[PDB]
Write a protein that binds this ligand. Structure first.
Ligand SMILES: [Cl-]
Ligand SMILES: [Cl-]
Ligand SMILES: [Cl-]
Ligand SMILES: [Cl-]
Ligand SMILES: [Cl-]
Ligand SMILES: [Cl-]
Ligand SMILES: [Cl-]
Ligand SMILES: [Cl-]
Ligand SMILES: [Cl-]
Ligand SMILES: [Cl-]
Ligand SMILES: [Cl-]
Ligand SMILES: [Cl-]
Ligand SMILES: [Cl-]
Ligand SMILES: [Cl-]
Ligand SMILES: [Cl-]
Ligand SMILES: [Cl-]
Ligand SMILES: [Cl-]
Ligand SMILES: [Cl-]
Ligand SMILES: [Cl-]
Ligand SMILES: [Fe+2]
Ligand SMILES: [Fe+2]
Ligand SMILES: [Fe+2]
Ligand SMILES: [Fe+2]
Ligand SMILES: [Fe+2]
Ligand SMILES: [Fe+2]
Ligand SMILES: [Fe+2]
Ligand SMILES: [Fe+2]
Ligand SMILES: [Fe+2]
Ligand SMILES: [Fe+2]
Ligand SMILES: [Fe+2]
Ligand SMILES: [Fe+2]
Ligand SMILES: [Fe+2]
Ligand SMILES: [Fe+2]
Ligand SMILES: [Fe+2]
Ligand SMILES: [Fe+2]
Ligand SMILES: [Fe+2]
Ligand SMILES: [Fe+2]
Ligand SMILES: [Fe+2]
Ligand SMILES: [Fe+2]
Ligand SMILES: [Fe+2]
Ligand SMILES: [Fe+2]
Ligand SMILES: [Fe+2]
Ligand SMILES: [Fe+2]
Ligand SMILES: [Fe+2]
Ligand SMILES: [Fe+2]
Ligand SMILES: [Fe+2]
Ligand SMILES: [Fe+2]
Ligand SMILES: [Fe+2]
Ligand SMILES: [Fe+2]
Ligand SMILES: [Fe+2]
Ligand SMILES: [Fe+2]
Ligand SMILES: [Fe+2]
Ligand SMILES: [Fe+2]
Ligand SMILES: [Fe+2]
Ligand SMILES: [Fe+2]
Ligand SMILES: [Fe+2]
Ligand SMILES: [Fe+2]
Ligand SMILES: [Fe+2]
Ligand SMILES: [Fe+2]
Ligand SMILES: [Fe+2]
Ligand SMILES: [Fe+2]
Ligand SMILES: [Fe+2]
Ligand SMILES: [Fe+2]
Ligand SMILES: [Fe+2]
Ligand SMILES: [Fe+2]
Ligand SMILES: [Fe+2]
Ligand SMILES: [Fe+2]
Ligand SMILES: [Mg+2]
Ligand SMILES: [Mg+2]
Ligand SMILES: [Mg+2]
Ligand SMILES: [Mg+2]
Ligand SMILES: [Mg+2]
Ligand SMILES: [Mg+2]
Lengths: 173, 173, 173, 173, 173, 173
């Protein structure tokens, strides 16, 4: 102590990165829950399932990149429990997509707060890291989910009998 | 003055070509507006967007071919402001297609007036140019848009929840 | 209720599968922690890191296969918090391997208890599932980790300066 | 209202992006005018023409990327008239290059003002977008045009009879 | 004066870039010295030599990219003497790696001061340039050297007879 | 001391090799300065730039081969500061080429003095090394630069507006 690599890396930044690692792992778990909701025999929308599973894997990648950043900068990873998602039953394709949009906006708000702290601590490496690997990816994800919610709402989800099925077999297929 | 190339090229034809260049640039801009309406998060019909973007690029090509004609004949290009489109909000896939059909018929009427002037001035090169590169392309575009309007109307656009989505993912996909 | 697919699937089996899903997710998290311990600047054994990361990914696969089994049989996945690992600092390559061996034996004991319950409930599909996809894989993993612990101990880990490095660059490389 | 995607996106940023879209479309139009000046029968420098046409197409791409950004962030595109360029007659290869350098510096100043507003509004996504896709491209364009102006001046443009021709057939060829 | 390209480029930034060019050239020279220490007949660690030679070449690239930046922005390169390194005799593989880690942290501190000046002068192009091409590369280099120092220390360098040789023929080979 | 490899290698030869290493590094730096003079926005002769950059890289190679010779013979490299070049502003393509010719003749004179010392000390290995790798390369470089100076002078450099540009785009292109 300190790490022989550590430079210009504030303890508050190190802790905020640890909190962000937990949030990305939590997001991965929410999407995993959603993926296996869509493969229930009474839901059976396999392209919704594959969509959410892919999202889950992406979140794990986001978490891992933060863990690598912690090591690269000489901070120490401190893991915490990954809380279970809010639901096992996600009710419908539309409801899952709306919950996913809210989750992505929440994660985005956390990333923006992290970038603000990094700016406050004069850490341009950390600022650049978030800008390069996180902020644009989050904007793209939010826009994609917004698009999906809009189409499902317009199509008459969740009550219209064909809407989720047609969306499954066209947009997500 | 005159250009050492100029031959059998009436000043009224030169001016009418300048007006047509502006109209084709205006059409390009209308279709650009439409393309980015369809990629709004609250519209999200990406194949409508690609359709209109392609139309926009075609209109720019039409404008450029007239600019090349002006130079080939020894006339002088005189550009004017490109007016903004009538709307940013194009309301629905059906409404955009109806507006596009009206725009194409209006551009066609201008081309027919240009051909009539070229005939009046005994300019068979200009007549041939419009016939070869413009008049049939315009008839094809009008027919395609008419077809698209018909299908959307029959399908129950804009109020029927599935119509624009199914048209997006079948006809324009 | 019941699921139109459910057959010969006891509620106690459904719950025990939910507990096993949590344990496999927990194992994934332990191995993730270990992987990023080995890429600290003050540990720097990249082949230990890759070894544990691969183990982490395998555990996630094991969890997912149980989630698929729950759906296939008409049970309902119920996720719980994934507890953080026992340590962030895993002390040495030998200590991590010893902890991993203990974790695998613990997971094995849980699988054997699950198989015993499935036998008690006359569920041969569930018995076969565990035998085909879990029990032999666990025996192989335990043997591999036992082998690695033995070599590290014989080589003089953790105090012998060359032992972990040579093991990293030969066995795990 | 607001867009279900909108987050951390200030109305002043949304308006400034709309102004920048207009400026990039205006730049595209200036370069289009220049391209077709160089293919007049009394100028006839086809590599100047191709150079400016390529620049025109690049500006349209820059405009489109801002329109996509507006949609991605949940803002609303508002288009305005595209003003005609300052000249149809661009006088000489040197004069066109000097006008293009001034236009690029003016567009750069607008981008720098946009980045300053984005910083003031704590919008790091928008800051990153301009840095990643705009600011370096503008510096490169300004340097290239500066280089071209220098060579043409040194060579004795516009009065030296060989200068524009040799530059056309070597540098731009 | 000023350069016809110069825009938003403060004289203090231009001078700080000149100082950074000298520091990167100095770093190249330190690593060149180290490379040829390791090919002495009484050291004879050819993979240490190749490692440092590669580092030397990278530093020259870093210097050249700053020289290109100076030209792109319209500043004027002003070169100074490149001071000789602190030693010809670098004592051991461990000592060279420790000196290289200190040199990289020193260069990093200079880059962070340059980024701070660029922020103070409202030069986002220069900020982006350092973030994109310098700051992450420096963090990666510091982490790699930290890793190498750790392994050599753990292995018993410099006194343990096998440590530098085994590191040479495994990690650097 | 002595090196177990050293044989027939006089201390005066070892020192003269150290002086020659410094001179070749100095030559590399002169050519680097010249290369980036030619990419200034107010010079903009990219093939002059590439020519000098290649020369710079060759000089570094010449320096490195002497450093390898020092090690092969059991001498000890002793580096000194690399002095900055005589100018940042090299005035014109002709002036740079004339300065480069003078620099190469000066380096040649040093090599001839080194060969004379090696002959005086009865060191045929060192004589052969200079003959095989240095003396003919220097004669070729001097002749090439002489040729380039002649053409630029005949063409009317530096005042004739086309001369440096045409030389850039034909001989160096
Ligand atoms: Cl620190
Ligand atoms: Cl969608
Ligand atoms: Cl329906
Ligand atoms: Cl006529
Ligand atoms: Cl149709
Ligand atoms: Cl419908
Ligand atoms: Cl049952
Ligand atoms: Cl083993
Ligand atoms: Cl040992
Ligand atoms: Cl070994
Ligand atoms: Cl907002
Ligand atoms: Cl140029
Ligand atoms: Cl001339
Ligand atoms: Cl300035
Ligand atoms: Cl290492
Ligand atoms: Cl040893
Ligand atoms: Cl001797
Ligand atoms: Cl020559
Ligand atoms: Cl001349
Ligand atoms: Fe995604
Ligand atoms: Fe990914
Ligand atoms: Fe991925
Ligand atoms: Fe992906
Ligand atoms: Fe994420
Ligand atoms: Fe809880
Ligand atoms: Fe996400
Ligand atoms: Fe920034
Ligand atoms: Fe078309
Ligand atoms: Fe076309
Ligand atoms: Fe086309
Ligand atoms: Fe087409
Ligand atoms: Fe048209
Ligand atoms: Fe108007
Ligand atoms: Fe049209
Ligand atoms: Fe395994
Ligand atoms: Fe597997
Ligand atoms: Fe696997
Ligand atoms: Fe495997
Ligand atoms: Fe497992
Ligand atoms: Fe706990
Ligand atoms: Fe396991
Ligand atoms: Fe069996
Ligand atoms: Fe360009
Ligand atoms: Fe482009
Ligand atoms: Fe392009
Ligand atoms: Fe391009
Ligand atoms: Fe632009
Ligand atoms: Fe006007
Ligand atoms: Fe531009
Ligand atoms: Fe940035
Ligand atoms: Fe490196
Ligand atoms: Fe490189
Ligand atoms: Fe390189
Ligand atoms: Fe490299
Ligand atoms: Fe560097
Ligand atoms: Fe000194
Ligand atoms: Fe470095
Ligand atoms: Fe960036
Ligand atoms: Fe050469
Ligand atoms: Fe060479
Ligand atoms: Fe070479
Ligand atoms: Fe060569
Ligand atoms: Fe040389
Ligand atoms: Fe001096
Ligand atoms: Fe030379
Ligand atoms: Fe001889
Ligand atoms: Fe010889
Ligand atoms: Mg949290
Ligand atoms: Mg009109
Ligand atoms: Mg448990
Ligand atoms: Mg404006
Ligand atoms: Mg200095
Ligand atoms: Mg000297």
């Amino acid at each position: 102590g300190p790490s022989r690599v550590r430079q210009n890396f504030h303890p508050d930044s190190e802790a905020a990165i640890n909190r962000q690692i937990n949030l990305e792992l939590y997001a991965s778990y929410v999407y995993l829950s959603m993926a296996y909701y869509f493969s229930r025999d009474d839901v059976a929308l396999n392209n919704f399932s594959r969509y959410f599973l892919h999202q889950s894997r992406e979140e794990t990648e986001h978490a891992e990149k933060l863990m690598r950043l912690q090591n690269q900068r000489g901070g120490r990873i401190r893991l915490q429990d990954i809380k279970k998602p809010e639901q096992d039953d996600w009710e419908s394709g539309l409801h899952a997509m709306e919950c996913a949009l809210l989750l992505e906006k929440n994660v985005n708000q956390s990333l923006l707060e992290l970038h603000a702290l990094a700016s406050d601590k004069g850490d341009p490496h950390l600022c650049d890291f978030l800008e390069t690997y996180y902020l644009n990816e989050q904007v793209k994800s939010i826009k994609e989910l917004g698009d999906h919610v809009h189409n499902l709402v317009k199509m008459g989800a969740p009550d219209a009998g064909l809407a989720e099925y047609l969306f499954d077999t066209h947009t997500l297929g």
